[PDB]
Structures are given as C-alpha cells and as structure tokens.
Design a binder for these strands. Structure first.
Ligand SMILES: [Mg+2]
Ligand SMILES: [Mg+2]
Ligand SMILES: [Mg+2]
Ligand SMILES: [Mg+2]
Ligand SMILES: [Mg+2]
Ligand SMILES: [Mg+2]
Ligand SMILES: [Mg+2]
Ligand SMILES: [Mg+2]
Ligand SMILES: [Mg+2]
Ligand SMILES: [Mg+2]
Ligand SMILES: [Mg+2]
Ligand SMILES: [Mg+2]
Ligand SMILES: [Mg+2]
Ligand SMILES: [Mg+2]
Ligand SMILES: [Mg+2]
Ligand SMILES: [Mg+2]
Ligand SMILES: [Mg+2]
Ligand SMILES: [Mg+2]
Ligand SMILES: [Mg+2]
Ligand SMILES: [Mg+2]
Ligand SMILES: [Mg+2]
Ligand SMILES: [Mg+2]
Ligand SMILES: [Mg+2]
Ligand SMILES: [Mg+2]
Ligand SMILES: [Zn+2]
Lengths: 196, 64, 100, 55
RNA sequence: UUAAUUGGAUUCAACGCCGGGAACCUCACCGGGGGCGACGGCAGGAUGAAGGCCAGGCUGAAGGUCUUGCCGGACGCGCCGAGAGGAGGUGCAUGGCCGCCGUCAGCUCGUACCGUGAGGCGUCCACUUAAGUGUGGUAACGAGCGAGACCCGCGCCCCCAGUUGCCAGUCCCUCCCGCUCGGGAGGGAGGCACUCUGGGGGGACUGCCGGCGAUAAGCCGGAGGAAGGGGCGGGCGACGGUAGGUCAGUAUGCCCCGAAACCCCCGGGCUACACGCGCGCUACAAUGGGCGGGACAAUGGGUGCCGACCCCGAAAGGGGGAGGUAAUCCCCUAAACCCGCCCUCAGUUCGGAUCGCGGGCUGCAACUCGCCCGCGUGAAGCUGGAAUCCCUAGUACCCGCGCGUCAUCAUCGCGC
RNA sequence: GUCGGGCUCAUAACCCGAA
C-alpha cells in the first residue's frame, strides 16, 4: 500500500547521505538533494572544495555516478556540485572542521575558541561546543565552551537550534566533538514587540 | 499556583503607558486592542496580557 | 468523462497549495469540480526500547510518521486537462490522475 | 572445488535470513512496513527518515 | 550436575531484563570434518607452475585425501616479512547512547563591595508558589541556563468540503403481517440534512461577585458555563556526579590469535534437577459448574499477504476460490452480562496437574525439543505464619481484543 | 540445640514455621 512507498524513498536517501558523508570528508560535505525528472534523477551535492569531488577533470564524477546507479537504486543519475549556503551557521560542518583541526595537532582550547570567534562574528545568536575524551592524560574528561543565547529544553530548542557531531581519531583513541548553533532570525515565544 | 509571568507583565506595562486612553474595564475590548497593537501569535498569551491590562486599568482608576 | 485526482504528502501546506491551484484552474474555466475531499490520515507508530543494553528501568520512545491525503473529482475536458497536466507539485507530494 | 566450503546456505526463514542493512546485526530487526533496521539503528536515524516524537 | 550445560546484570536502580517466545540458522559453548596469506621478496615452473574431474576405497557425508589417469595454461605458503578477519582481553584506556540522584529547584556569570587567604555577597529575611514561582525589605545593581512559556492529543461551538463515508424526510418497484384503515424489510432514483472524516476559526482571562491578606504578591468561597483556577493526559530532564551499565548493536586505542582465538558444514548443548528465591497463571467453588437460547466494542494489520462464498469432515483440519496495493474487499456477529433447565455445600457435575491410545498442521528436519483435536485418567488444593506490594476517577478491581516477535509457537512487552 | 524463611546495604540481636 501507500505507506510502503514513502518509507522506501526515505531509507535510500539516508543510505546515500551516509555513504557521501564518509566518502567526501575532505571536501566539507554539507548535505545533498534529489529531484525526480521525466528523464531521470538530478542529484545536487554541497561541498567546500568542488574540485575534490570533480577530482582533477572528471574520473571521479564518473565513478560516483556508477556507484549511485549500481550500488544504490537511482535510475539514470546526473550529479551537480554546488556551494554551501551559510557554512558558519551549519553545526555539522563546524564539527567536522574542529575534528580535522584536532587531527592536525592543534590544542583543543585554541581550536574551540577560534571556531566560536568565527561563528559569532558571522552573525549567530549563540553557540555551544563540547569536546570529550583522553585530553591531556589517560583519564578522560569533558570540556564545554559557550557564549550567547541558546535554548536547550522544549520545542523551540528542537526546531530552531542546529546540531552536529563528529569523531576525531588521534593516536591515543577517539575524541568526540558536539556543536550547537542558533541562527540570527530565530525568535523565542516570549519575544513580543508592540506594533508602533 | 496562578503566578503571572514576568514577560507578560513587562509587555502589558509597556502597552498601558503608551496609549493611556485606549484600554477600558472590558475584557473583550482589551483583547481586541492587544490583538491590534502587538505581534502576539498565541491566543493564550493574548488573553493573559489583556487580563492584566484590565486589572491595571481598574487599579489606577480606583487610585490604588 | 470524469477524472479522479489523488494526492498524498507528509506536509499539510504543500498538499493544500496543490489542491488550491487545481481549484483555481477549475475556476478559470466553465467546469464543475467536486471540492477536495479529505480522506483519513495514515499514521505509522513505532515503539522502541531506549537503552542499548538491558540494565536499568525500561523506558520507551514512540516515533510517529503522518501521511495526509486528499481526493478531487473533475470532468475530463481537454481545455482544462492541459492546464492541470502541466502543473508540477513539490517533490514531497505524490499525484495520481485517472479517468473514470 | 574448495571455495564451496566457505559459502553459506541461502535460508528463507529464521533469524539467519534477516540482517540489518546498516550494521549487519542479526536479531532485533524491525520488520514493520518493509524497514529492515535494528532497534539500535532505528533510534538514531528516525529523525532523518521523517519520524517525530509527538507524545 | 555435565563433553558442553556460552556470556552480561545482584538493594531501591539484577532476576517475562539484554526487545533473550534459541528445533537448523541465531551462537558466542561441546565432539568431529574441511577452507583462507592482497603486496614484497626466496626454492620453483612451458621439458609445465597454482588450480579442476568420470568411476571405486577411507568417511557421518565428502576429488578433503587416496587409488585408477585424465584435465587446463602463469604464476608461485615448501620460507621469511606482511596483511585480511576476530561475539578473543580490557566499560578501570575511550566515543556515542541509557539508568539513578531528580521534571528535584537547582547551577552560574559582568561590575561593585567584604576578608591576609581558602572564600563571601547577589543566591539572605517576611509572606507567597507545583517551582531560585512572585511581592516587599536589604552592599548590592543587573544578566544567562534550568522552571514556566513551547509541542501532540481529549471534551463544547462555527465555516468550508460530500467519496471509497452517512440515509432523515421525498418518488417508484418487490415481498411479509392482525388482510390492511395501519405496521415492517430489501432494491433503485435522489439528497449532504444527521453521524463521520480533516483544514481553518471561536472559546477561560482569577475576566465578574463577596471575604482573608497590605491597599502588594496571592489564597478561600459563589454565579454563569461544554469546560475553572498548569482545564485533563502525554513529549521535552540544567551545571554536574555516580571509575553505575554497554567495546556481545554499530565506531575506536592498546594487548593478544593469525594455519588458528579467522571462514564454512554435520551431530549435540543453552530445554539437565535432592534443593533456595523473584514475577505471574489456574484454583481451592453458589458473590458458582454445566447445557440450550438472547445482547452491545475500540485500537490496529493485510500482495513472501488478508481471504468472503461454496463443497467435504464429529473435531483439529482438507479441496476450489470473488474482492482487496485498501474510508471501497478481508481479518470481524468479543467476553464479562441477560433468560430457562440440571447440580445443593460435597474433595462434589469443585479443581484439571499427570499419563495411555488414536487423528492433524508448519517445516529440509518434530527423539532429544514444537503447536492443535477426540476418548479415557483424575494429583495437591477446603482462604493462606512472621512479613510485604499497587492505586485518588472513567482511576483501582473484573472482562475480553489488536500489534510486536513470527515458517510454525504467547501464561510476555506495548496498546485498545 | 538442628534445618528453612522473614527483617537489614550487610552481619549480630530480634520475629515466624518445622523436624
Ligand atoms: Mg517545560
Ligand atoms: Mg547462564
Ligand atoms: Mg521455541
Ligand atoms: Mg544451535
Ligand atoms: Mg563506567
Ligand atoms: Mg542536586
Ligand atoms: Mg582585598
Ligand atoms: Mg554563595
Ligand atoms: Mg543554591
Ligand atoms: Mg550566606
Ligand atoms: Mg527563575
Ligand atoms: Mg499540563
Ligand atoms: Mg564499573
Ligand atoms: Mg553493580
Ligand atoms: Mg536460557
Ligand atoms: Mg470441572
Ligand atoms: Mg452459554
Ligand atoms: Mg472429582
Ligand atoms: Mg503417541
Ligand atoms: Mg517431540
Ligand atoms: Mg487433600
Ligand atoms: Mg468447601
Ligand atoms: Mg520476552
Ligand atoms: Mg541475621
Ligand atoms: Zn543496526
């Protein structure tokens, strides 16, 4: 029946998104979108360095089209590569960037403060970052960085805040990175104004 | 406990001062006035604000 | 000589938009169109245990997916059928047209 | 033929005929409406599929 | 106890928990049998490496090995590195998730001020609140996260909409009754009234009245009202701690195995049984048991499927098969309850454990170790010591039903 | 005195049943 049709579409998109998440980690992957046309399927991919996805004049778009058509269930795909709309308001991108900075060898506090500075300058109401794992020794710990306005409990926190998570694999083990960001156009229920 | 909320009181005090000759001791009239003079979107919040404005009008008119 | 149009979506606004556009097309021409009939909403509820292990008090999540539906009847006239056949619904909407 | 002794028998029923499409686990598989996902995996991807916790 | 009876969890917060209802699989345990080393290089190899077979032995069964002799053409585990894979160790090396403290009212910040300093102040006092919820006073004045606001559903009213849902009034046709003045039942035309479905809107604000408190914050009692004082039921759990649980869901460091601790196949085991314990089911009967007759649901689910309707059979079941990708067809004419008759306080016409014989279904397989039906058989139990659990209204008690798991199997979980 | 169960985070004391 009809319910089975909607579930099949959702699962395939989730599998494709996860495969692209891991595959395009160096390109600053920032989501995808799929549109259905009478000739086939238009697949739009978002990234920071589209040259990496293109991969030195093709030889990689062909591979990805073959993967999409064979392994996954798209018929006659066509991949376009675009640019991220508001990268500093996307928690997932920032979590991946902080994780890569940690993998390079920067100290965790400096990386966290740099990311917060960029996010706040780019027009966000608030940001919260948490970093957990074996930071400075064999006994694990968690550290939290914060500034601005950020709702945490209730329906507004669910529908307004952008959330992201990433793992950073260092020589001693993994380090978890969590990011939350609230946009400039977010308005809480208790913020009323008088119509002048 | 029916303790009035802070932001309701703040906005009702702001509305009352700006238009002293706009709110009466009628709940329906004040409800329509709150509807026209703000961007409040919740029906519950509008009613709370209108009720507090009614109490303010009768408290100041009585002279406290 | 009548066509039956079936619509379904997870979003109420888009569904409403498509139905209103078809209604405007049926208004723009001399043709009777039975109003969009709302069929009962399909609900998919799944209940799961929250913990990965089996220690501690048992607690549960109740996840829900809602699929809304509409039904529209119109008389198959080509001057009116061309306008409706060229409409593009958003990708999150299923549309099916049949002739009865 | 030696590779014959590595190969699995293709069952059609039992716990061995169903694996999670995300992590490969046997066992607690949610079969509702054609999903094939473990209880563990369904919890963390349910929002991406469009499910919500209304109550 | 055993060849093995695989492992985790032990006060609340372990013990129908790990969605753990395991015949194979699952599987990690036990007995036995086979297979696997990308890439670098050593002996080697067309005078053919590695790999593959008709027949018959060994064998539980096997070109696995062997015998009998055929095949094919290029890499090379007889060797050293190296690697794949690992439900192997470590939750006291970690990430993520979850339980508890606790939906408790807490945790903090900027500047000022106090103390040599650790620190203090705000965050204290009175009254008030479900609430660090508020109103006044104050070396504090202000602010953030949590509370509340917010989101989903239930109960009343209006507008729009009329199919696959509804049938009151109206017209025709057919058949019944007390023979038709009157009363019923189908079918068709027709309609959207009513029920219902689902988009939008209204409605409740301590707003009105009288008291207490201060004339503040609020509290107590009345009207009107579908609804009255978070209206009712849910989702959402702050800074942290608990070396709480989980590497046996997935991710991951180190250590190990690496011709076996990796990968497959067959048969066993997780279902053992002097005994201690948790949570339940069925009873100990009349506030009942049996036999015939009569009533009224809701949630959900269906193409690897739900199956009306006809035929066959005493039953379980068997042979055909309309419609259904579903407001259309099906699961689907619930039980507790009501009427009449037998039994009359008894280990019984209470109870139905245990066992014999026979008939079925699913499955590759029913002994170990599955579920159903007919006849027979007829254990303990006659109300429960010391202790101890749940629940404040459509709640508790009592009664059945749907879905998950699922080829078959529900004394369970989640819902009606 | 023996054995078993209660109570306690647990042991002793204490309570109950039995041979
Ligand atoms: Mg709240
Ligand atoms: Mg055990
Ligand atoms: Mg079983
Ligand atoms: Mg087994
Ligand atoms: Mg721990
Ligand atoms: Mg505390
Ligand atoms: Mg000083
Ligand atoms: Mg203090
Ligand atoms: Mg405090
Ligand atoms: Mg003090
Ligand atoms: Mg507060
Ligand atoms: Mg409430
Ligand atoms: Mg521990
Ligand atoms: Mg413990
Ligand atoms: Mg067991
Ligand atoms: Mg009997
Ligand atoms: Mg009867
Ligand atoms: Mg007897
Ligand atoms: Mg027999
Ligand atoms: Mg048997
Ligand atoms: Mg006796
Ligand atoms: Mg008796
Ligand atoms: Mg169970
Ligand atoms: Mg003792
Ligand atoms: Zn899984």
């Amino acid at each position: 029946a009809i319910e089975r049709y909607f579930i099949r579409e959702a699962v395939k998109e989730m599998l494709i998104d996860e495969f692209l998440e891991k595959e395009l980690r160096r390109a600053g992957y920032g989501g995808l979108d799929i549109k259905k046309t009478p000739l086939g399927t238009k697949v739009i991919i978002f990234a920071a360095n589209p040259g990496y996805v293109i991969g030195r004049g093709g030889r990689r778009i062909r591979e990805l089209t073959r993967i999409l058509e064979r392994q996954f269930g798209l018929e006659n795909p066509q991949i376009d590569v675009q640019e991220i709309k508001n990268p500093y308001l996307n928690a997932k991108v920032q979590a991946v960037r902080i994780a890569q900075a940690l993998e390079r060898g920067i100290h965790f506090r400096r990386a966290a403060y740099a990311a917060m500075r960029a996010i706040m300058s780019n027009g966000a109401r608030g940001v919260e970052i948490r970093i957990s794992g074996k930071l400075t020794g064999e006994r694990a710990k968690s550290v939290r960085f914060y500034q601005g306005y950020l709702a945490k409990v209730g329906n507004p926190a669910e529908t307004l805040v952008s959330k992201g998570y990433a793992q950073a694999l260092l020589k001693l083990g993994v380090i978890g990175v969590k990011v939350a960001i609230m946009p400039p156009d977010a308005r809480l229920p208790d913020e009323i104004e008088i119509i002048e | 406990g029916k303790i009035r909320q802070g932001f309701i009181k703040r906005v009702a005090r702001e509305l009352f001062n700006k238009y002293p000759n706009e709110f009466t001791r009628d709940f329906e009239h004040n409800k329509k006035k709150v509807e026209e003079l703000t961007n409040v979107t919740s029906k519950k919040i509008r009613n709370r604000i209108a009720g507090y404005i009614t109490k303010l009008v009768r408290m100041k008119e009585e002279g406290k | 000589q009548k066509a039956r149009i079936k619509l379904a979506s997870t979003n109420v606004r888009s569904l409403e938009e498509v139905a209103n556009q078809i209604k405007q097309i049926a208004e723009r021409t001399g043709v009777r169109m039975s109003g969009p009939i709302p069929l009962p909403t399909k609900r998919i509820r799944i209940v799961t245990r929250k913990s990965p292990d089996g220690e501690g008090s048992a607690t549960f999540d109740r996840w829900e997916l809602r699929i809304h539906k509409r039904l529209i009847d119109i008389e198959a006239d080509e001057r009116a059928m061309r306008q409706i056949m060229r409409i593009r619904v958003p990708e999150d909407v299923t549309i099916e047209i049949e002739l009865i | 033929a030696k590779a014959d002794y590595n190969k699995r028998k293709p069952r059609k029923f039992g716990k061995g005929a169903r694996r999670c499409i995300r992590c490969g686990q046997y066992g607690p598989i949610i079969r509702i409406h054609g999903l094939m996902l473990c209880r563990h995996c369904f919890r963390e991807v349910a929002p991406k599929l469009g499910f919500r916790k209304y109550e």
